[PDB]
């Protein structure tokens, strides 16, 4: 297929993992970063900022080949989540839920 098709397909069902509570998309948070004029606090905070649409975007230009660079790339994407969002909020819940989402998406993709 490609990298890009494949997680273009990875991601498409990421997004389609609901909340249980509001069925809000689990990946609501992860699409884009924030603005840093907005939330110049995060990037003090969080070294390696990612998000979906940069993976997307390295998936395009060359910079990801392989899936192990985009499983480390969602790797970071969930710790930075994890570090920055108190534990139990639903953004480091959402982040938990995913992560364990895409860990099986890696183990089944064979």
């Known amino acids: ?3 890009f098709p494949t997680v273009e397909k990875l991601v498409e ?12 998309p689990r990946t609501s948070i992860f699409e884009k970063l924030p603005s840093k004029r907005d939330y110049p606090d ?3 905070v969080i070294e390696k900022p990612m998000a979906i ?3 997307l975007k390295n998936c395009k230009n060359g910079t990801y080949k392989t899936l192990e660079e985009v499983r480390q790339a969602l ?3 969930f710790e930075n989540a994890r ?6 909020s639903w953004v480091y ?3 938990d839920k995913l ?12």
């Open 83 to 88: 570090f920055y969002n108190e534990e139990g």
């Open 42 to 44: 995060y990037f003090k």
């Open 1 to 3: 297929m490609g990298i």
């Open 53 to 55: 649409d940069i993976i």
């Open 99 to 110: 992560n364990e989402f895409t860990d099986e998406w890696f183990k089944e993709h064979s």
């Open 75 to 77: 790797q970071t994407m």
């Open 13 to 24: 069902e990421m997004r389609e993992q609901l909340d249980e509570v509001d069925s809000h």
């Open 93 to 95: 819940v959402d982040a």
